Amino acid sequence: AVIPHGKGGRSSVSGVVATVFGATGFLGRYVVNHLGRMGSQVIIPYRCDVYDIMHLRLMGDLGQLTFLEWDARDKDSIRKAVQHSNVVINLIGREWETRNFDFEDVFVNIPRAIAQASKEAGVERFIHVSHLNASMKSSSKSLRSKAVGEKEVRSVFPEAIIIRPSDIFGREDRFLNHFANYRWFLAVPLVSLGFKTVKQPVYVADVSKGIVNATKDPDAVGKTFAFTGPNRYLLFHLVKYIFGMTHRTFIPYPLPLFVYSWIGKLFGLSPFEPWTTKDKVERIHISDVMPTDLPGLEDLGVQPTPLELKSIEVLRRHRTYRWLSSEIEETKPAKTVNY
């Protein structure tokens, strides 16, 4: 049944079963929507509470999506999820380090275990998602850790696809938003005033379409990829683009990363969810990456979508009424960088 037997759409089948582990958060809800609209079964392992997995139940058709509970501490949950799949996708990743899990676990130990069972179960593809510009000694606890794992993944389950996306924008993101949120607290306290650091941002759908195409693309095997996105923007300009599109006053008062590092520490202390933290602060200001030679969305078949276009949808909320109705051509025009 890897023979797709139907007109494309729900109720067809493209015959690729898949275990998409991080399908409770931000990126996986789009992956299930594409894998799903592609009518492929998706065994979605959820450790969450069912009330929060419902939003996934309609992104599929009768029987397409199957759910089962998995906790990273114990295997056999990883084993049974990947037992009947042929595709496996890893989207596990947390910004903060909850008392129970370290960047160690969510980025190395776990993906390793999943991939372990993946190879053990015979799944052909272990699409894994590590961050762009994320290598060892990248001076950020997570990014460094993330790359360490990329190796563990490769070692155990070779011939694996590894996507390393740039910052991911799109609704419900924590990229544009973190910057947008600054409105609430004072003004944007951008380090380097936001200059001197450039970020390539890619829409969630562009990454999601890429992961789906990769699961079904033969040449993709053993191929790393970088989903950079269409334009490289300096941080100060992008925060200014978030503002104006947010329609709230902008003030890029500077300060050193070390202060903001000490600062976020406290925000991280927040028990529920850090509003920001040292690791995040770092990956924003210092983190900057120039892709050089990796296939990318175009290669995998996606036309990266510029941020100039789909920014209404993710910032139209952050406007006060009386500005909500503001259209796009009105939005403060942005500009791209090379650096």
Partner 1 sequence: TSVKPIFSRDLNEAKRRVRELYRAWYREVPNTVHLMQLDITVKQGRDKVREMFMKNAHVTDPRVVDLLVIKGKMELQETIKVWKQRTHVMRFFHETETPRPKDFLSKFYMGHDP
Partner 2 sequence: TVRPRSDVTHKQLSAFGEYVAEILPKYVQQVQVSCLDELEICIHPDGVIPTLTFLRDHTNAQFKSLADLTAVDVPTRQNRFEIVYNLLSLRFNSRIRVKTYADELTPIDSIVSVHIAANWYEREVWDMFGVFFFNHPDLRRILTDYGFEGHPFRKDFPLTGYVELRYDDEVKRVVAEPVELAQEFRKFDLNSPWEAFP
Partner 3 sequence: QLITVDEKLDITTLTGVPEEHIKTRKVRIFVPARNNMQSGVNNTKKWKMEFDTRERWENPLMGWASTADPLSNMVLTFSAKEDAIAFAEKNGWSYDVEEKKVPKPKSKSYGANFSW
User: Which parts of this chain interact with ligand NDP (CB under 6 A)?
Assistant: 22, 24-28, 47-48, 72, 91-94, 101, 106, 129, 131, 165, 167-168, 175
Reduced to 3 states (helix: H, G, I; strand: E, B; else coil), residue 337 is strand
Contact region with partner 3 (CB under 8 A), list: 58-66, 74-82, 130-138, 307-315 = 58-66
Contact region with partner 1 (CB under 8 A), list: 79-87, 157-165, 237-245, 305-313 = 305-313
Do the bridges between strand 65-69 and strand 42-46 make them parallel or antiparallel, or are there none, so unpaired?
parallel
Euclidean distance between CA atoms 326 and 323, whole angstroms: 5
Nearest distance from C-beta of residue 131 to ligand NDP, angstroms? 4
Select the binding partner of residue 293 from partner 3, partner 1, partner 2, none (C-beta < 5 to 8 A, by kind): none
Contact region with partner 3 (CB under 8 A), list: 10-18, 21-29, 97-105, 291-299 = 10-18
The Cα-based distances of 171 to 194, 202, 203, 298, 315 in angstroms read: 22, 12, 9, 22, 8
Of the pair 1, 259, the CB lying nearest partner 3 is at 1
User: Does residue 62 belong to the site contacting partner 3 (CB under 8 A)?
Assistant: yes
Structure tokens at 16: 């690729």
Which DSSP string do the residues of 169-201 spell out, in sequence order? ESTT-SSHHHHHHTTTSSS---GGGG-S-EE-E
Nearest distance from C-beta of residue 253 to partner 2, angstroms? 35
User: Does residue 2 belong to the site contacting partner 2 (CB under 8 A)?
Assistant: no
Nearest distance from C-beta of residue 47 to partner 1, angstroms? 30
Q: How many C-alpha atoms does 248 have within 13 Å on its Cβ side?
A: 22
What is the per-residue binding string for partner 2 in 62-101, x denoting contact by CB under 8 A?
A: x---------------------------------------
Contacts of 309 (CB under 8 A, 6+ apart): none
Which DSSP string do the residues of 204-257 spell out, in sequence order? HHHHHHHHHHHHT-GGGTT-EEEE--S-BEEHHHHHHHHHHHS-S--------H
Contact region with partner 2 (CB under 8 A), list: 8-16, 74-82, 116-124, 141-149 = 8-16
Structure tokens at 65: 């999506």
Of the pair 94, 316, the CB lying nearest partner 2 is at 316
Contacts of 198 (CB under 8 A, 6+ apart): 232, 233, 234, 235, 288, 337, 339
Structure tokens at 77: 């949950």
Of the pair 292, 325, the CB lying nearest ligand NDP is at 292
Select the binding partner of residue 277 from ligand NDP, partner 1, partner 3, none (C-beta < 5 to 8 A, by kind): none
User: Does residue 1 belong to the site contacting partner 3 (CB under 8 A)?
Assistant: yes
**Selected binder of partner 1 within 1, 8, 73, 273 (CB under 8 A):** 8
Euclidean distance between CA atoms 95 and 98, whole angstroms: 9
Select the binding partner of residue 129 from partner 2, ligand NDP, partner 1, none (C-beta < 5 to 8 A, by kind): ligand NDP
**Selected binder of partner 3 within 12, 77, 192, 261 (CB under 8 A):** 12
Q: Which residues is the chain interrupted after (C–N above 2.5 Å)?
A: none
Of the pair 5, 55, the CB lying nearest ligand NDP is at 55
Structure tokens at 132: 């762009």
What is the per-residue binding string for partner 1 in 21-60, x denoting contact by CB under 8 A?
A: ----------------x-----------------------
Give the amino acid at 55. H
Structure tokens at 55: 């939003």
Residues at the contact surface with partner 3, assessed by CB under 8 A: 1, 5-7, 9, 11-13, 41, 62-64
